Design a protein around this ligand. Structure first.
Ligand code: GLC
Ligand code: GLC
Ligand code: GLC
Ligand code: GLC
Ligand code: GLC
Ligand code: GLC
Ligand code: GLC
Ligand code: GLC
Ligand code: FRU
Ligand code: FRU
Ligand code: FRU
Ligand code: FRU
Ligand code: FRU
Ligand code: FRU
Ligand code: FRU
Ligand code: FRU
Ligand code: MN
Ligand code: MN
Ligand code: MN
Ligand code: MN
Ligand code: MN
Ligand code: MN
Ligand code: MN
Ligand code: MN
Ligand code: MN
Ligand code: MN
Ligand code: MN
Ligand code: MN
Ligand code: MN
Ligand code: MN
Ligand code: MN
Ligand code: MN
Ligand code: MN
Ligand code: MN
Ligand code: MN
Ligand code: MN
Ligand code: MN
Ligand code: MN
Lengths: 387, 387, 387, 387
């Protein structure tokens, strides 16, 4: 049961299963994985494809010829396995040159370099067939208030994305950008810290249609935000281009637990919303097998990502299909929420005495919402306890 | 020193100093304040003006004759003191009818009622000279995941704000709207939980130019976010129509401490930003004197709000004027951040070898940012260890 | 399925199902419940018993004769239904006199009054057969740093509990005290903010054996702490006298959701630990049906508390009984954790070359912990997805 | 002004200024610092001393001859500067062997190794003149609920500390132990997560008088707790053996900002408490110059730590000396808090009608606490708006 297949569109970053277990207080506990090994093992587990930072696939500082060779080996593995590369991204955070940012470094020469590094890898992404190009500005921010004028930083962020827009437009590429928010870590505060801030920003870009969000479960949870609500907003705006799935236990460092771990109920409501909305993008896992684990545990953790998505999918489908839930949805007036408030228009509203002068506010107030019964059906479904 | 005058544009909600001290675990510790007394006492302390919810000024359910009497008394005290009313707002949260929201209540009739109640108060705000009308959707949200389809709720929110914009335009009113975010409380999760989410939503409205944000110090802090950063993004977008100033000690219930209390450094960096940016709107305090206090403490706390703003203004000004700080700003390349990355344009960037093949990435990486020195000069100035 | 009965030892505060829905931003949405009604309805749902604050059962300020009458009616209901009263507590937080605390009010006359109120209700608790007397110092704390010398406050807290100890000892009562931690709300910071701080404090009391903790799921979660870890510590110390069960979604105001809601996985690990440890005290629900609900929803929410405990119990028992989990526990060396580190003693340890000079650190390092596979079995069990 | 001198007892970890800037998302930005250089540079800035983990001073795996060489060089620099070594500690977290803990690793052999590694360094700490030996159980904990039986882990922790106490007693060493709490990071939840939990644990040890706490400003803040309150509880218990001073901006990853940065008011109230209490231990900074910084910024940040302590000391002293503050303290009844509730004893309290039947609860309730005025005088003093 719950065996994933390519139809489920599960993808993994090379850096996920490849994470060697180095944390701020600890050395690596696992050897480096060859990207080819990761492609084959994930394919065997039922993955649809993989994603990469430039520097995951090609060691920083490789010559043109070594770079060709890294890419060729990886392509070969993709071809043998049928694995795809739906997304790609830039490492603008590891090299010490990026210590104050890539696109919003105070040093202009660094910001230019950030863009050139990005553009080179956009060409590679396109060659590999990537439809989304993720930007995570992990170094864009500050630890102190006078280090970063955030209005200037946003000008430079806009300038950078606008230039990327012009680049992909000039080349005739079908690739869209997805901005991945995170509120802090490894900067004290990161710019565009949440889905909202990234959606807002995108509207000020010269070609806003080329840009969307790549939200991450744990990142919105590091600001204590409701992740399914934020995905709903992104879907309402037409901007959910990609998603990173994982787990997180509240407000703390970014844990990057396998999906289903962390806030299990929020995972449930998330699957429900994505499936209800018909989200057709990759179900991409950005997680890290804990450094406690050997390679067998790495693969178990990867497999558990996909397993939990499928169990949740089944329970959410069973919840939405249950006629008793559908009656509960009516009792709670979810159907009334979907009706326009005033299709009759402003003047009709103002002339409607029953909306104000004759509104019996106490009778409306007395109506229970029936949300707890609804939510207990949802719980019973999640837990497969439908009595 | 630090005596506020009405030119400082300090305003207060009636519900601030008028808070009777009822919290979820306790009864009122103070008697109701007549709004006349609030107006007079705040003017004597050097306030510029007051703001109100409809229900602070006119108790819910008042007859027309009671309404006229409450407004007449309030108008006389405004007259007598010279106090302005720059902002007003609707209470769409207290009354049991609003338990599932106003604009996004699942019941349609409640949504229409919310709109009518709002509209009525827009008229009154205009009569009193308000330039901004705030919306705080405190009840818009959910405790449980099935209770609220967030995409439908956002359709309903957009409808409501669009109708309000249609109303003010049809009436020829100069007033603009400001959305005040809050992440949670009294709902488990509130819709448009942060400055980013509200900013993004506005761009989807029919007349986006009529709508900005009214961010609150404590509310962004309740999501663990950087409030000065949030304000910078609002200013960058042209959307800082109004602000609520107060204090909060991290991620917990909404404390509404006096301005200056809570995160003092963030208060410093906020004042620096507002004053640097030439923000010309009201410096509005949304705070609650703690229920420990009697009426004499109410006034002390309100005076404290204004005094802290002025002390921090002086310290920020001394910081910016210090020749050591200016040299520090240059050593930290804040001036370079303000300049374009690639005003030579995309093709010149792509052709610039110094941006990529010939960029000495180790030399750039080795150059310290000098942020700690800069930040210590800021601390020195804040603490008055430099004048 | 999952029908609760008195054998499950589920209890409810009168104030839980009786909460009228007043929050800091909202009026009551439900009428007051008669305590007799609450006793009968809970009995019908399969509850074992009820708990009370003095002021839930007897309106503050009742005369001796009205007080007798309130108590008599309640006793009658207990007798008809067979409901018990295993715990009782004092309201030292609602009346404005307690605005700076009961036991640690700065005013000495208030602290004395706090003790007299408490002692009167301890006599009533005993008469009703209560074995635990809970203290929740919801008002003990501060909003500002100079208001409360916390060393003095702790002296006064110790003095108060020591006097209560002497009282119950002098009267020959079999009643034990359980201190309920909460980190903040309605004070900015509450004294003894966590299980740890309360356990620590108890060790400085004159008769520490008379005192334990009454931890609450949501309260430890408001400090972002692992609730099952804290219960484990309390059980390790012999101090888990009582427990409050409910749900909470991270770090925010105290939500008091029905149990199972909030952090569902932490609910699972909690049930597992309590059942594994043979906790024999009440399974007491301190929750509040959301103010969205009418009385039918109040009773559904109460019923869902108990239902979720039973589902979780079943899954946790199935997890612990599964031989495949037992092999996984061995693979992860949980059994080795339970063995003494050095029963051979200090000198033997120092003479053991294989523990240091000849310890192959790299071979030990290479061993995977197998925790992810273990945890995925736990997930599969929780979700009833054992494939 | 505010030049530190060695009498101020300011100490620094080698790992503080020596931090090379490697974080989970980035490589080192600074070269390794020779501990000799750290000792010399900190002495010139007016430090009192340094502290170390075994592995900071002697790289993991050093031969005896390398060990002697590293220690000789360090001893000469201590000699040359007059710098003390008041505290030392074990690195039981970096090496992959410690991935599931040292003292509470599930594998027994790892636990024994942790103890032997610790013991060896206790000898060295004593040789260098340390009075305190810190334990920080950074790896003791779990990511998942089944991985760690917390009751068994606490049996193992107690065993370990008891063995260490047996060791120092058998050797006749004057050294005492201090447990440093942290709630999470690098483990999902760490055991003994706060000051309270560590304090409670100590009372269960065989020789509790040998053990206190080494609380860290940022660590308690990572649970959203009040650090000055935590310190007051440690002082009240006689257990504040050592302290780590730094800064943190709320609930997130461990920032380790310089002291003064982060929550400035909490830093003020901490200094007031330490100085009022006559705390005589080291003022130890556990901070990391941000990786943005070069070596000149490293020194600026370290100097900033000491300077902020001294500025805050002066401001707290001026606050306590101000005649208006003294009157404010009396108006707020801080003096009454310091006096007993009922030194007349239980029977006199029970017989005192003024404590109950005849207590005028409305008059007491009406008396304001005047905390806001007091707190504004504190703000004035902190900001230098009063001298
Ligand atoms: O206190 C934290 C720091 O101390 C130790 O030196 C570790 O080796 C370092 O990597 C760690 O992050
Ligand atoms: O953007 C690509 C990825 O970059 C880094 O690995 C991040 O830590 C991550 O969350 C992100 O999803
Ligand atoms: O930081 C604020 C300054 O930089 C901004 O990004 C704007 O371009 C400029 O007009 C403003 O005055
Ligand atoms: O009643 C006060 C409420 O409405 C106002 O618009 C406020 O800014 C919001 O913070 C608050 O709770
Ligand atoms: O901003 C918050 C306050 O504003 C309004 O006056 C409400 O009536 C009050 O109860 C609320 O808590
Ligand atoms: O102590 C009894 C109860 O008192 C109050 O109702 C609290 O808010 C609660 O959590 C506690 O459990
Ligand atoms: O606040 C600190 C003072 O109060 C304490 O609780 C002690 O009893 C006293 O010795 C100390 O000096
Ligand atoms: O390496 C630094 C580590 O060990 C020390 O004992 C520290 O106080 C702790 O905060 C830290 O991470
Ligand atoms: O420091 C703890 C580290 O552990 C992880 O959560 C993976 O288990 C990383 O995301 C993090 O950097
Ligand atoms: O002050 C109102 C309070 O009364 C209670 O019922 C306590 O008996 C609490 O839940 C509620 O918060
Ligand atoms: O103007 C009519 C209103 O005025 C009052 O009489 C004042 O006492 C209200 O009770 C009534 O509805
Ligand atoms: O001191 C004012 C604040 O304190 C509380 O009463 C605590 O529950 C809040 O509701 C309010 O914002
Ligand atoms: O303010 C929100 C209120 O709602 C509750 O969570 C119950 O649904 C209360 O615990 C809280 O006071
Ligand atoms: O700098 C180390 C980093 O390298 C990555 O693999 C990115 O490719 C990240 O997960 C990790 O944190
Ligand atoms: O003292 C022996 C040690 O000294 C070194 O030779 C220094 O280069 C080490 O490699 C060796 O183990
Ligand atoms: O600036 C020092 C701090 O910044 C980080 O590098 C961010 O990941 C932390 O690990 C460290 O405490
Ligand atoms: Mn399938
Ligand atoms: Mn990128
Ligand atoms: Mn600027
Ligand atoms: Mn969790
Ligand atoms: Mn992440
Ligand atoms: Mn991600
Ligand atoms: Mn809103
Ligand atoms: Mn604070
Ligand atoms: Mn607020
Ligand atoms: Mn506000
Ligand atoms: Mn510019
Ligand atoms: Mn049963
Ligand atoms: Mn009590
Ligand atoms: Mn004192
Ligand atoms: Mn949750
Ligand atoms: Mn609670
Ligand atoms: Mn409780
Ligand atoms: Mn420990
Ligand atoms: Mn801060
Ligand atoms: Mn730290
Ligand atoms: Mn530390
Ligand atoms: Mn005393």
């Amino acid at each position: 049961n719950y065996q994933p297949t390519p139809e489920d569109r599960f993808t993994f970053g090379l850096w996920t299963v490849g994470w060697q277990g180095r944390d701020p207080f600890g050395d690596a506990t696992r050897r480096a994985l060859d990207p080819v090994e990761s492609v084959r093992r994930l394919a065997e587990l039922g993955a649809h494809g993989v994603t990469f930072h430039d520097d995951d696939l090609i060691p920083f500082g490789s010559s043109d010829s070594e770079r060709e060779e890294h890419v060729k080996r990886f392509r070969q593995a993709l071809d043998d396995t049928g694995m795809k590369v739906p997304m790609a991204t830039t490492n603008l955070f590891t090299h010490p040159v990026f210590k104050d940012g890539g696109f919003t470094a105070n040093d202009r020469d660094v910001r230019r370099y950030a863009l050139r590094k990005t553009i080179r890898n956009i060409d590679l992404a396109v060659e590999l067939g990537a439809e989304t190009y993720v930007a995570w500005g992990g170094r864009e921010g500050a630890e102190s208030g006078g280090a970063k004028d955030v209005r200037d930083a946003l000008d430079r962020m806009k300038e950078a994305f606008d230039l990327l827009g012009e680049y992909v437009t000039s080349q005739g590429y079908d690739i869209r950008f997805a901005i991945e928010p995170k509120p802090n870590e490894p900067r004290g505060d990161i710019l565009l810290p949440t889905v909202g801030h990234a959606l807002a920003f995108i509207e000020r870009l010269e070609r806003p249609e080329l840009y969307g969000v790549n939200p991450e479960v744990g990142h919105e949870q590091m600001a204590g935000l409701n992740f399914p609500h934020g995905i709903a907003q992104a879907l309402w705006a037409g901007k959910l281009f990609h998603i990173d799935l994982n787990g997180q236990n509240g407000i703390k460092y970014d844990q990057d637990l396998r999906f289903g771990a962390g806030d299990l109920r929020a995972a449930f409501w998330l699957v429900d919303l994505l499936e209800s909305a018909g989200y057709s993008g990759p179900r991409h896992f950005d997680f890290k097998p804990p450094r406690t684990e050997d390679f067998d545990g790495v693969w178990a953790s990867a497999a558990g990502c996909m397993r939990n998505y499928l169990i949740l999918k089944e329970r959410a489908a069973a919840f939405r299909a249950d006629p008793e839930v559908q009656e509960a949805l009516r009792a709670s007036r979810l159907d009334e929420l979907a009706r326009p408030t005033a299709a009759d228009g402003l003047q009709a509203l103002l002339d409607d005495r029953s909306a104000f002068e004759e509104f019996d506010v106490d009778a409306a107030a007395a109506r229970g919402m029936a949300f707890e019964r609804l939510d207990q059906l949802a719980m019973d479904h999640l837990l497969g306890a439908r009595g």
